[PDB]
Every structure is written in C-alpha cells, then in structure tokens.
Amino acid sequence: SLTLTLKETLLASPGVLFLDDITIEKVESEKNLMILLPGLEYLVTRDLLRTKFPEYDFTGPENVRITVEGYSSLKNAVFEEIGKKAEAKDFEAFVVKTFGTLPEKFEPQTIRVTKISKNLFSVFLRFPDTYVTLNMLLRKERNVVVLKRNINVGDVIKEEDVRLEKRNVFEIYGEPFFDVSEVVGKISRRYLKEGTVLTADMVKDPPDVVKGQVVPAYVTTFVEVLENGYLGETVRAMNSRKYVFGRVERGPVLRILE
C-alpha cells in the first residue's frame, strides 16, 4: 500500500512499541508490535513487519535497532540465563519477537529459556501479573582471520596470506582464529579460495621433524628421517646405512627402539 521508510535506531522507554515509532513519516496505528522491557535491545525485522503489516511495503535499513532505557537488572538476569542454556558467554542478544502483555512491574519471578533453532532462544518471563516471551537472536561479532589469496593442500600459512575481518562467530562452521599469530606457521589441510574464514579444522600444526631432516639419535649418532613426524610418533629413518624405527622425542631427537 504505502512505502514507509524505517528509522535506523530508536531510543525507547518501557511500554508498547507501535509502527509510528520506527517510521520517518507519521502513521496512525494502535496494534502492539513489541513489548518493550527495560534495559533490553530490540531488532525490528522485515519478517516481523511482513507478519504484522503484510499490506505495506518497507524501505530503509534491514532492521530497526531499539534500545530501551531502564535499570540493567532484568537484562543481567536474562543474559545470565541465556548463557546457561546456550552454553555461550560474551554475546550480544536482540529481541526479534515478543508475546504476552506489558507487565505492571519489571521484576520477573521466573526466567525460563528454550532453544527455538540455531542462535534463537525463547526467553519466558513470569511476572506476578502476567507473562512475556522474548524470542532473542544471539550474536557474537568478532574479528576473524580470512584468506587474502588461494592456498593449497600442504601450504604453510604466512602473514601475507591472511587478513582480519569482522564476522558473526555464531554463523561460522568450525572454530575460527582471532589473530594472525594463531595461524602463521600452520599447514593447510585443503585447497581454499580467497574469502574463506579460516577454521581450526582446516589447518594442522607443523611437524616436529620433517622428511629428510638430520636429527641426533639414541640406540649416539645423527640420522636422516624417512617421514614427517610429531612428538611421540615412531618415524622410520636411515643411519651410515640401515633401517631404524625411532620415536620422535623432546629435542627433537630420535630414540631408536631396541
């Protein structure tokens, strides 16, 4: 019907949020969009707007970000609870849907959190007078190590291969790296293309001995390694002449078995 331009952000107070609050033009509307609770952050999405007002189109920013004024006790108690059910710490959470009524007082009796899907939790609040459910999207935005260029199986990562980029860690499959210093010296297990967020499962540590390396050995001599090897591994070797089984030991020396 109408194309309403969305505000980028809104500072609010506890109560009921209406469409007029998040649009640049004046609209009259009496329908409850969100239940605004003190100290919590809200994100009004297009999917919310398509549900509530399917008859209108919307332009502007992807989401409207709403900060509600108030003491931080409810927030704290909610965040502590999400932390326990989610497994996570140091995260941001945004309410993207609410159900229930605006309570008279904002001191919850009970706080119950259940997983809806990936990164989405239903935070149920019991108040002496009523109930609020907040559907909260979890975000952990951090600087991660991303490839500047294509790399192959067996390539050593160097500082020139990688840059740092801000990403949502909760939308990365695998454990990312937060420092170039964590990945330099590592050996790629795969052919990766530029733009690939580096994760722990794609790289391996450098070997403690390499194939062809000269190391001291105990049976009182130096040997030449037939394979790459890590500490504790038994690597085949040669030396003047013969075949020897030898474990990589702290050193790195080989210890020739028997």
PDB file of C-alpha atoms in Angstrom:
ATOM      1  CA  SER A   1       0.000   0.000   0.000  1.00  0.00           C
ATOM      2  CA  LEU A   2       2.304   2.718   1.328  1.00  0.00           C
ATOM      3  CA  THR A   3       6.090   2.525   1.373  1.00  0.00           C
ATOM      4  CA  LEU A   4       7.205   3.544   4.844  1.00  0.00           C
ATOM      5  CA  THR A   5      10.828   4.476   5.454  1.00  0.00           C
ATOM      6  CA  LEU A   6      12.307   2.830   8.542  1.00  0.00           C
ATOM      7  CA  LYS A   7      14.333   4.619  11.211  1.00  0.00           C
ATOM      8  CA  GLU A   8      17.863   3.291  11.726  1.00  0.00           C
ATOM      9  CA  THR A   9      17.733   3.327  15.527  1.00  0.00           C
ATOM     10  CA  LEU A  10      15.287   4.271  18.290  1.00  0.00           C
ATOM     11  CA  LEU A  11      15.815   5.073  21.972  1.00  0.00           C
ATOM     12  CA  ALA A  12      12.705   3.966  23.829  1.00  0.00           C
ATOM     13  CA  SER A  13      11.192   3.565  27.279  1.00  0.00           C
ATOM     14  CA  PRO A  14       9.384   0.509  28.584  1.00  0.00           C
ATOM     15  CA  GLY A  15       5.899   0.015  27.146  1.00  0.00           C
ATOM     16  CA  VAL A  16       4.350  -0.966  23.847  1.00  0.00           C
ATOM     17  CA  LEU A  17       6.097  -0.224  20.543  1.00  0.00           C
ATOM     18  CA  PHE A  18       3.987   0.949  17.610  1.00  0.00           C
ATOM     19  CA  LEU A  19       4.834   1.197  13.905  1.00  0.00           C
ATOM     20  CA  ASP A  20       4.784   5.040  14.105  1.00  0.00           C
ATOM     21  CA  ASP A  21       7.774   4.844  16.482  1.00  0.00           C
ATOM     22  CA  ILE A  22      10.003   3.168  13.868  1.00  0.00           C
ATOM     23  CA  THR A  23       8.937   5.102  10.753  1.00  0.00           C
ATOM     24  CA  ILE A  24      10.060   8.506   9.474  1.00  0.00           C
ATOM     25  CA  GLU A  25       6.539   9.517   8.350  1.00  0.00           C
ATOM     26  CA  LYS A  26       3.544   9.872  10.696  1.00  0.00           C
ATOM     27  CA  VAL A  27       1.318   6.791  10.747  1.00  0.00           C
ATOM     28  CA  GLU A  28      -1.680   6.164  12.987  1.00  0.00           C
ATOM     29  CA  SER A  29      -1.737   2.609  14.351  1.00  0.00           C
ATOM     30  CA  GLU A  30      -2.918   1.010  17.566  1.00  0.00           C
ATOM     31  CA  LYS A  31      -1.596  -2.536  17.168  1.00  0.00           C
ATOM     32  CA  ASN A  32       1.095  -3.866  19.515  1.00  0.00           C
ATOM     33  CA  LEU A  33       4.320  -4.582  17.645  1.00  0.00           C
ATOM     34  CA  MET A  34       6.701  -5.349  20.528  1.00  0.00           C
ATOM     35  CA  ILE A  35       6.623  -5.373  24.339  1.00  0.00           C
ATOM     36  CA  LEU A  36       9.482  -3.078  25.327  1.00  0.00           C
ATOM     37  CA  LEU A  37      11.243  -4.115  28.583  1.00  0.00           C
ATOM     38  CA  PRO A  38      13.799  -2.039  30.390  1.00  0.00           C
ATOM     39  CA  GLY A  39      17.485  -2.465  29.518  1.00  0.00           C
ATOM     40  CA  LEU A  40      16.972  -4.824  26.555  1.00  0.00           C
ATOM     41  CA  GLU A  41      17.884  -4.328  22.885  1.00  0.00           C
ATOM     42  CA  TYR A  42      15.326  -4.914  20.145  1.00  0.00           C
ATOM     43  CA  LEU A  43      15.702  -5.593  16.450  1.00  0.00           C
ATOM     44  CA  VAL A  44      12.621  -4.996  14.319  1.00  0.00           C
ATOM     45  CA  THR A  45      12.979  -7.250  11.285  1.00  0.00           C
ATOM     46  CA  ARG A  46      11.315  -7.309   7.853  1.00  0.00           C
ATOM     47  CA  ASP A  47       9.924 -10.748   8.695  1.00  0.00           C
ATOM     48  CA  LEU A  48       8.194  -9.195  11.720  1.00  0.00           C
ATOM     49  CA  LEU A  49       6.833  -6.396   9.544  1.00  0.00           C
ATOM     50  CA  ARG A  50       5.647  -8.827   6.836  1.00  0.00           C
ATOM     51  CA  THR A  51       3.702 -10.672   9.566  1.00  0.00           C
ATOM     52  CA  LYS A  52       2.204  -7.652  11.353  1.00  0.00           C
ATOM     53  CA  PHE A  53       1.638  -5.408   8.327  1.00  0.00           C
ATOM     54  CA  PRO A  54       1.639  -7.549   5.145  1.00  0.00           C
ATOM     55  CA  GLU A  55      -0.314  -4.815   3.337  1.00  0.00           C
ATOM     56  CA  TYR A  56       2.520  -2.257   3.490  1.00  0.00           C
ATOM     57  CA  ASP A  57       5.976  -2.199   1.905  1.00  0.00           C
ATOM     58  CA  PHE A  58       9.048  -1.055   3.803  1.00  0.00           C
ATOM     59  CA  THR A  59      12.231   0.714   2.781  1.00  0.00           C
ATOM     60  CA  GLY A  60      15.330   1.865   4.689  1.00  0.00           C
ATOM     61  CA  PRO A  61      17.712  -0.221   6.856  1.00  0.00           C
ATOM     62  CA  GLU A  62      17.341  -4.005   7.101  1.00  0.00           C
ATOM     63  CA  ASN A  63      16.342  -3.813  10.758  1.00  0.00           C
ATOM     64  CA  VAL A  64      15.442  -1.100  13.260  1.00  0.00           C
ATOM     65  CA  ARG A  65      17.573  -1.192  16.422  1.00  0.00           C
ATOM     66  CA  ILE A  66      15.748  -0.173  19.623  1.00  0.00           C
ATOM     67  CA  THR A  67      17.394   0.480  22.986  1.00  0.00           C
ATOM     68  CA  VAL A  68      15.019   0.559  25.956  1.00  0.00           C
ATOM     69  CA  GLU A  69      16.032   2.742  28.912  1.00  0.00           C
ATOM     70  CA  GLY A  70      15.993   1.270  32.427  1.00  0.00           C
ATOM     71  CA  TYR A  71      17.994  -0.388  35.180  1.00  0.00           C
ATOM     72  CA  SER A  72      20.028  -3.329  33.940  1.00  0.00           C
ATOM     73  CA  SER A  73      18.860  -5.975  36.399  1.00  0.00           C
ATOM     74  CA  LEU A  74      16.316  -7.742  34.211  1.00  0.00           C
ATOM     75  CA  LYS A  75      18.804  -7.757  31.287  1.00  0.00           C
ATOM     76  CA  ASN A  76      21.532  -9.169  33.547  1.00  0.00           C
ATOM     77  CA  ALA A  77      19.230 -11.903  34.858  1.00  0.00           C
ATOM     78  CA  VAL A  78      18.070 -12.706  31.323  1.00  0.00           C
ATOM     79  CA  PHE A  79      21.659 -12.751  29.921  1.00  0.00           C
ATOM     80  CA  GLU A  80      22.926 -14.926  32.783  1.00  0.00           C
ATOM     81  CA  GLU A  81      20.108 -17.368  31.973  1.00  0.00           C
ATOM     82  CA  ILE A  82      20.728 -17.423  28.193  1.00  0.00           C
ATOM     83  CA  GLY A  83      24.423 -18.057  28.983  1.00  0.00           C
ATOM     84  CA  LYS A  84      23.471 -21.221  30.878  1.00  0.00           C
ATOM     85  CA  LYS A  85      21.065 -22.673  28.293  1.00  0.00           C
ATOM     86  CA  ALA A  86      23.017 -21.550  25.209  1.00  0.00           C
ATOM     87  CA  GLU A  87      26.492 -22.577  26.517  1.00  0.00           C
ATOM     88  CA  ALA A  88      27.868 -19.188  25.424  1.00  0.00           C
ATOM     89  CA  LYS A  89      29.482 -16.128  27.049  1.00  0.00           C
ATOM     90  CA  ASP A  90      30.364 -12.541  25.916  1.00  0.00           C
ATOM     91  CA  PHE A  91      27.496 -12.462  23.418  1.00  0.00           C
ATOM     92  CA  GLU A  92      25.011  -9.885  22.184  1.00  0.00           C
ATOM     93  CA  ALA A  93      21.279 -10.686  22.214  1.00  0.00           C
ATOM     94  CA  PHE A  94      18.474  -8.856  20.399  1.00  0.00           C
ATOM     95  CA  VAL A  95      14.788  -9.484  20.893  1.00  0.00           C
ATOM     96  CA  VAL A  96      13.146 -10.061  17.491  1.00  0.00           C
ATOM     97  CA  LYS A  97       9.657 -11.151  18.557  1.00  0.00           C
ATOM     98  CA  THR A  98       7.695 -10.749  21.805  1.00  0.00           C
ATOM     99  CA  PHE A  99       4.499 -12.453  23.004  1.00  0.00           C
ATOM    100  CA  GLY A 100       2.291 -11.645  26.007  1.00  0.00           C
ATOM    101  CA  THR A 101       1.266  -8.421  27.731  1.00  0.00           C
ATOM    102  CA  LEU A 102       3.204  -5.475  29.125  1.00  0.00           C
ATOM    103  CA  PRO A 103       3.667  -6.219  32.843  1.00  0.00           C
ATOM    104  CA  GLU A 104       2.965  -3.668  35.573  1.00  0.00           C
ATOM    105  CA  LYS A 105       6.306  -4.250  37.289  1.00  0.00           C
ATOM    106  CA  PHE A 106       9.536  -5.439  35.657  1.00  0.00           C
ATOM    107  CA  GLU A 107      10.906  -7.807  38.339  1.00  0.00           C
ATOM    108  CA  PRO A 108      10.398 -11.321  36.966  1.00  0.00           C
ATOM    109  CA  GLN A 109       9.580 -14.257  39.216  1.00  0.00           C
ATOM    110  CA  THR A 110      10.863 -16.941  36.847  1.00  0.00           C
ATOM    111  CA  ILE A 111      13.143 -16.845  33.801  1.00  0.00           C
ATOM    112  CA  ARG A 112      12.976 -19.901  31.516  1.00  0.00           C
ATOM    113  CA  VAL A 113      14.996 -20.146  28.278  1.00  0.00           C
ATOM    114  CA  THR A 114      14.436 -22.710  25.489  1.00  0.00           C
ATOM    115  CA  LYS A 115      16.179 -23.206  22.130  1.00  0.00           C
ATOM    116  CA  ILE A 116      13.963 -22.495  19.129  1.00  0.00           C
ATOM    117  CA  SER A 117      16.605 -23.048  16.459  1.00  0.00           C
ATOM    118  CA  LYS A 118      20.210 -22.096  15.711  1.00  0.00           C
ATOM    119  CA  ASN A 119      21.043 -18.833  17.553  1.00  0.00           C
ATOM    120  CA  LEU A 120      17.403 -18.277  18.555  1.00  0.00           C
ATOM    121  CA  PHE A 121      16.076 -18.683  22.092  1.00  0.00           C
ATOM    122  CA  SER A 122      12.664 -18.175  23.695  1.00  0.00           C
ATOM    123  CA  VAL A 123      13.077 -16.316  26.967  1.00  0.00           C
ATOM    124  CA  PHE A 124       9.951 -16.744  29.046  1.00  0.00           C
ATOM    125  CA  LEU A 125       9.334 -14.293  31.890  1.00  0.00           C
ATOM    126  CA  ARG A 126       6.766 -14.763  34.618  1.00  0.00           C
ATOM    127  CA  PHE A 127       5.605 -11.697  36.385  1.00  0.00           C
ATOM    128  CA  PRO A 128       3.208 -11.540  39.356  1.00  0.00           C
ATOM    129  CA  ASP A 129       0.576 -10.097  36.967  1.00  0.00           C
ATOM    130  CA  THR A 130       1.376 -11.546  33.512  1.00  0.00           C
ATOM    131  CA  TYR A 131       3.812 -13.325  31.141  1.00  0.00           C
ATOM    132  CA  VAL A 132       6.301 -12.159  28.469  1.00  0.00           C
ATOM    133  CA  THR A 133       8.062 -14.415  25.913  1.00  0.00           C
ATOM    134  CA  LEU A 134      11.023 -12.770  24.121  1.00  0.00           C
ATOM    135  CA  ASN A 135      12.474 -14.519  21.097  1.00  0.00           C
ATOM    136  CA  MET A 136      16.104 -13.478  21.183  1.00  0.00           C
ATOM    137  CA  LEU A 137      18.679 -13.707  18.378  1.00  0.00           C
ATOM    138  CA  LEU A 138      22.195 -14.345  19.636  1.00  0.00           C
ATOM    139  CA  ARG A 139      25.232 -12.708  18.004  1.00  0.00           C
ATOM    140  CA  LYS A 140      28.949 -12.870  18.705  1.00  0.00           C
ATOM    141  CA  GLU A 141      30.625 -10.438  16.331  1.00  0.00           C
ATOM    142  CA  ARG A 142      34.430 -10.620  16.317  1.00  0.00           C
ATOM    143  CA  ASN A 143      37.486 -10.066  14.136  1.00  0.00           C
ATOM    144  CA  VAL A 144      38.417 -13.359  12.481  1.00  0.00           C
ATOM    145  CA  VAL A 145      41.228 -14.477  10.157  1.00  0.00           C
ATOM    146  CA  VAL A 146      40.158 -14.505   6.494  1.00  0.00           C
ATOM    147  CA  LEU A 147      42.155 -15.545   3.393  1.00  0.00           C
ATOM    148  CA  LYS A 148      43.678 -12.860   1.134  1.00  0.00           C
ATOM    149  CA  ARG A 149      44.581 -15.453  -1.509  1.00  0.00           C
ATOM    150  CA  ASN A 150      44.055 -19.057  -2.649  1.00  0.00           C
ATOM    151  CA  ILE A 151      46.037 -21.727  -0.825  1.00  0.00           C
ATOM    152  CA  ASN A 152      46.657 -25.429  -1.476  1.00  0.00           C
ATOM    153  CA  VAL A 153      46.992 -28.683   0.480  1.00  0.00           C
ATOM    154  CA  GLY A 154      50.337 -28.551   2.283  1.00  0.00           C
ATOM    155  CA  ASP A 155      50.852 -24.792   2.004  1.00  0.00           C
ATOM    156  CA  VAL A 156      52.303 -23.028   5.063  1.00  0.00           C
ATOM    157  CA  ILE A 157      50.192 -20.033   6.102  1.00  0.00           C
ATOM    158  CA  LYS A 158      52.210 -16.807   6.238  1.00  0.00           C
ATOM    159  CA  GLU A 159      51.226 -13.245   7.243  1.00  0.00           C
ATOM    160  CA  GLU A 160      50.757 -12.346   3.565  1.00  0.00           C
ATOM    161  CA  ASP A 161      48.073 -14.995   3.107  1.00  0.00           C
ATOM    162  CA  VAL A 162      45.697 -13.648   5.739  1.00  0.00           C
ATOM    163  CA  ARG A 163      43.834 -10.548   6.853  1.00  0.00           C
ATOM    164  CA  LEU A 164      41.462  -9.780   9.716  1.00  0.00           C
ATOM    165  CA  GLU A 165      37.712  -9.280   9.144  1.00  0.00           C
ATOM    166  CA  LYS A 166      34.697  -8.751  11.432  1.00  0.00           C
ATOM    167  CA  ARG A 167      32.305 -11.755  11.377  1.00  0.00           C
ATOM    168  CA  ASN A 168      29.468 -13.382  13.340  1.00  0.00           C
ATOM    169  CA  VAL A 169      31.161 -16.283  15.133  1.00  0.00           C
ATOM    170  CA  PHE A 170      27.744 -17.904  15.641  1.00  0.00           C
ATOM    171  CA  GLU A 171      27.369 -18.195  11.851  1.00  0.00           C
ATOM    172  CA  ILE A 172      30.785 -19.810  11.305  1.00  0.00           C
ATOM    173  CA  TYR A 173      31.018 -23.606  10.969  1.00  0.00           C
ATOM    174  CA  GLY A 174      34.065 -24.626  12.979  1.00  0.00           C
ATOM    175  CA  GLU A 175      36.265 -22.713  15.404  1.00  0.00           C
ATOM    176  CA  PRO A 176      37.732 -19.534  13.855  1.00  0.00           C
ATOM    177  CA  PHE A 177      41.014 -17.724  14.628  1.00  0.00           C
ATOM    178  CA  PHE A 178      41.111 -14.278  16.227  1.00  0.00           C
ATOM    179  CA  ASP A 179      44.735 -13.442  15.484  1.00  0.00           C
ATOM    180  CA  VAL A 180      47.144 -13.844  12.574  1.00  0.00           C
ATOM    181  CA  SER A 181      49.643 -15.056  15.204  1.00  0.00           C
ATOM    182  CA  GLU A 182      47.398 -18.087  15.842  1.00  0.00           C
ATOM    183  CA  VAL A 183      47.544 -19.298  12.226  1.00  0.00           C
ATOM    184  CA  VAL A 184      51.010 -18.379  10.868  1.00  0.00           C
ATOM    185  CA  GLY A 185      53.199 -21.462  10.586  1.00  0.00           C
ATOM    186  CA  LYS A 186      50.181 -23.746  10.243  1.00  0.00           C
ATOM    187  CA  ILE A 187      49.865 -26.092   7.282  1.00  0.00           C
ATOM    188  CA  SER A 188      46.681 -26.105   5.185  1.00  0.00           C
ATOM    189  CA  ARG A 189      44.853 -29.440   5.016  1.00  0.00           C
ATOM    190  CA  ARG A 190      42.980 -28.224   1.934  1.00  0.00           C
ATOM    191  CA  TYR A 191      42.676 -26.116  -1.176  1.00  0.00           C
ATOM    192  CA  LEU A 192      40.863 -22.987  -0.018  1.00  0.00           C
ATOM    193  CA  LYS A 193      39.824 -19.954  -2.059  1.00  0.00           C
ATOM    194  CA  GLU A 194      40.226 -16.284  -1.093  1.00  0.00           C
ATOM    195  CA  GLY A 195      37.492 -15.036   1.275  1.00  0.00           C
ATOM    196  CA  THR A 196      37.438 -18.283   3.241  1.00  0.00           C
ATOM    197  CA  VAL A 197      37.174 -17.760   7.005  1.00  0.00           C
ATOM    198  CA  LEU A 198      39.946 -19.896   8.423  1.00  0.00           C
ATOM    199  CA  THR A 199      38.932 -22.504  10.978  1.00  0.00           C
ATOM    200  CA  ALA A 200      40.833 -24.940  13.225  1.00  0.00           C
ATOM    201  CA  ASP A 201      39.642 -27.988  11.252  1.00  0.00           C
ATOM    202  CA  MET A 202      41.246 -26.765   8.010  1.00  0.00           C
ATOM    203  CA  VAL A 203      44.808 -26.474   9.217  1.00  0.00           C
ATOM    204  CA  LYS A 204      47.323 -28.567  11.104  1.00  0.00           C
ATOM    205  CA  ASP A 205      50.418 -27.807  13.123  1.00  0.00           C
ATOM    206  CA  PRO A 206      53.905 -28.069  11.562  1.00  0.00           C
ATOM    207  CA  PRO A 207      55.598 -31.472  12.189  1.00  0.00           C
ATOM    208  CA  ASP A 208      58.286 -31.734  14.870  1.00  0.00           C
ATOM    209  CA  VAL A 209      60.562 -33.462  12.345  1.00  0.00           C
ATOM    210  CA  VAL A 210      60.389 -33.345   8.556  1.00  0.00           C
ATOM    211  CA  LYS A 211      61.226 -35.995   5.967  1.00  0.00           C
ATOM    212  CA  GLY A 212      64.958 -35.782   5.197  1.00  0.00           C
ATOM    213  CA  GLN A 213      65.909 -33.736   8.275  1.00  0.00           C
ATOM    214  CA  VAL A 214      69.084 -34.535  10.241  1.00  0.00           C
ATOM    215  CA  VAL A 215      68.457 -35.147  13.941  1.00  0.00           C
ATOM    216  CA  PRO A 216      70.511 -36.679  16.773  1.00  0.00           C
ATOM    217  CA  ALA A 217      69.503 -40.241  17.691  1.00  0.00           C
ATOM    218  CA  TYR A 218      69.951 -42.703  20.566  1.00  0.00           C
ATOM    219  CA  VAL A 219      70.269 -46.510  20.423  1.00  0.00           C
ATOM    220  CA  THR A 220      74.887 -41.954  19.880  1.00  0.00           C
ATOM    221  CA  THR A 221      74.574 -40.665  16.280  1.00  0.00           C
ATOM    222  CA  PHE A 222      72.814 -38.490  13.655  1.00  0.00           C
ATOM    223  CA  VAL A 223      70.086 -39.932  11.385  1.00  0.00           C
ATOM    224  CA  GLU A 224      68.002 -38.943   8.355  1.00  0.00           C
ATOM    225  CA  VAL A 225      64.213 -39.074   8.739  1.00  0.00           C
ATOM    226  CA  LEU A 226      62.142 -41.038   6.158  1.00  0.00           C
ATOM    227  CA  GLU A 227      58.807 -39.385   7.047  1.00  0.00           C
ATOM    228  CA  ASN A 228      57.412 -36.221   8.611  1.00  0.00           C
ATOM    229  CA  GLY A 229      56.640 -36.698  12.317  1.00  0.00           C
ATOM    230  CA  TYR A 230      55.289 -35.304  15.573  1.00  0.00           C
ATOM    231  CA  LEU A 231      56.415 -35.952  19.145  1.00  0.00           C
ATOM    232  CA  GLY A 232      55.692 -39.477  20.289  1.00  0.00           C
ATOM    233  CA  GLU A 233      55.373 -40.774  16.778  1.00  0.00           C
ATOM    234  CA  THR A 234      57.575 -43.556  15.531  1.00  0.00           C
ATOM    235  CA  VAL A 235      59.277 -42.494  12.284  1.00  0.00           C
ATOM    236  CA  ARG A 236      61.436 -44.689  10.004  1.00  0.00           C
ATOM    237  CA  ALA A 237      64.984 -43.415   9.410  1.00  0.00           C
ATOM    238  CA  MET A 238      68.409 -44.284   7.911  1.00  0.00           C
ATOM    239  CA  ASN A 239      71.829 -44.268   9.674  1.00  0.00           C
ATOM    240  CA  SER A 240      75.560 -44.856   7.906  1.00  0.00           C
ATOM    241  CA  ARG A 241      73.320 -47.456   6.255  1.00  0.00           C
ATOM    242  CA  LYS A 242      70.426 -49.402   7.830  1.00  0.00           C
ATOM    243  CA  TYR A 243      66.684 -49.262   8.664  1.00  0.00           C
ATOM    244  CA  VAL A 244      65.765 -47.987  12.131  1.00  0.00           C
ATOM    245  CA  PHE A 245      62.454 -47.473  13.925  1.00  0.00           C
ATOM    246  CA  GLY A 246      62.662 -44.336  16.039  1.00  0.00           C
ATOM    247  CA  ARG A 247      60.285 -42.302  18.163  1.00  0.00           C
ATOM    248  CA  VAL A 248      60.362 -38.528  17.945  1.00  0.00           C
ATOM    249  CA  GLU A 249      61.336 -37.294  21.372  1.00  0.00           C
ATOM    250  CA  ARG A 250      61.558 -33.887  23.003  1.00  0.00           C
ATOM    251  CA  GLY A 251      64.530 -32.270  21.278  1.00  0.00           C
ATOM    252  CA  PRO A 252      63.936 -33.166  18.658  1.00  0.00           C
ATOM    253  CA  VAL A 253      65.983 -36.355  18.855  1.00  0.00           C
ATOM    254  CA  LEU A 254      65.013 -39.782  17.570  1.00  0.00           C
ATOM    255  CA  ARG A 255      65.134 -42.644  20.001  1.00  0.00           C
ATOM    256  CA  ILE A 256      65.864 -45.850  18.135  1.00  0.00           C
ATOM    257  CA  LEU A 257      63.730 -48.703  19.507  1.00  0.00           C
ATOM    258  CA  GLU A 258      65.758 -51.768  20.609  1.00  0.00           C
TER     259      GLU A 258
END
